Write a protein that binds this ligand. Structure first.
Ligand code: 1E0
Length: 264
C-alpha cells in the first residue's frame, strides 16, 4: 500500500530544507535507502493528495523519481521518494558549470523528454516542469519529480496565474493567461528547461519582473540561444515556444527529434 508506518522509516541525515520543510536521507524497512520530505501543516491539501494515492502510485518509469508512499500517522506528514544522490538539476548545472560536454547536456534533455513522454502517454500534466524539479541520480541520470503537485499547493500566491510567486518563467501564454494546463503547456516549460540545461543553470529572464516576462512573451520575445546549444537544438527549443499549443510538438515527437540529433 501507499501508507508507510513511522516504524518503517529511520531518519539518518538532514540533506536540505525544501519549500514544505526538511529533506532527510533515510532508510525504508526491507526496501531501500530513501529521501524523506517532511511537509509543514497547511502547505498542502493532504486529503486531496491521499485520495489520488492508490492510482498515482502506479506511475513508474526509469526517468521519473519514484514516490513510494506517505507516512501520515501524525502531523507533519512525510513523503518517501527514491534517493537521488546528486540533488536537483538546477544546482547540479550551476556547480558543474564549464565541465559539461554538449553531448551530456543534450543527454540530460533526453532523460527529461523520455520521462515527460511517459507522463504525456499516461495523460499526467506536470504543471511546473523546471530544472529545480528535476533530480540527478546514479551515473548522472536525470529524472522528473513533483509532477502534478501544484494541484495540492495551498499557497494561492504560487498557484494562481495572478499570484505574486506564480512560476511565470516556465509558463506558456495560455497558462499565464488562463491556467489552461496540458501536455502542450508542459512542452513550453520543457523548452525553458532545455534553455536552463544548455545555459548551465542560468535563470531564464533574470532581468525581468513577472509582468515584463508576460509582456515580452506576448510580443514575440524568446530566450536567446545559449552558446552550448547548436542551431538545431535551438530550433527544437523555439518549437516548444510556439504561441499556439496546437503548433508545439508532442513530447513523443520531441523525443524522436532529440534522439535523432543525439545519435547522429
Ligand atoms: C503516496 C503515494 C503516491 O501518492 C500520490 C498521490 C497523488 C499524486 C498526485 C500527483 C502526482 C503524484 N506522484 C508524484 C510522483 N513522483 C514524484 N517524484 O513526484 C508519483 C510517482 N508515482 O512516483 N506520483 C501523486 C502521488
Amino acid at each position: 500500500k501507499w501508507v508507510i508506518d513511522p516504524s518503517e522509516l529511520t531518519f539518518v541525515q538532514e540533506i536540505g530544507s525544501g519549500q514544505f520543510g526538511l529533506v532527510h536521507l533515510g532508510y525504508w524497512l526491507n526496501k531501500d535507502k530513501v529521501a524523506i520530505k517532511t511537509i509543514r501543516e497547511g502547505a498542502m491539501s493532504e486529503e486531496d493528495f491521499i485520495e489520488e494515492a492508490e492510482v498515482m502510485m502506479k506511475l513508474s518509469h526509469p526517468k521519473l523519481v519514484q514516490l513510494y508512499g506517505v507516512c501520515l500517522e501524525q502531523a507533519p506528514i512525510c513523503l518517501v521518494f527514491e534517493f537521488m544522490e546528486h540533488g536537483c538539476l538546477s544546482d547540479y548545472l550551476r556547480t558543474q558549470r564549464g565541465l559539461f560536454a554538449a553531448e551530456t547536456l543534450l543527454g540530460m534533455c533526453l532523460d527529461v523528454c523520455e520521462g515527460m513522454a511517459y507522463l504525456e502517454e499516461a495523460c499526467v500534466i506536470h504543471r511546473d516542469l523546471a530544472a529545480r524539479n528535476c533530480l540527478v541520480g546514479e551515473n548522472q541520470v536525470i529524472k522528473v519529480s513533483d509532477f502534478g503537485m501544484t494541484r495540492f499547493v495551498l499557497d494561492d500566491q504560487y498557484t494562481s496565474s495572478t499570484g505574486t510567486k506564480f512560476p511565470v518563467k516556465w509558463a506558456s501564454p495560455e497558462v499565464f493567461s488562463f491556467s489552461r494546463y496540458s501536455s502542450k503547456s508542459d512542452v513550453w516549460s520543457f523548452g525553458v528547461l532545455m534553455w536552463e540545461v544548455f545555459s548551465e543553470g542560468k535563470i531564464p529572464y533574470e532581468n525581468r519582473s513577472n509582468s515584463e516576462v508576460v509582456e515580452d512573451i506576448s510580443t514575440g520575445f524568446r530566450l536567446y540561444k545559449p552558446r552550448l546549444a547548436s542551431t538545431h537544438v535551438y530550433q527544437i527549443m523555439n518549437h516548444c515556444w510556439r504561441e499556439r499549443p496546437e503548433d508545439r510538438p508532442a513530447f513523443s515527437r520531441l523525443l524522436r527529434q532529440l534522439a535523432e540529433i543525439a545519435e547522429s
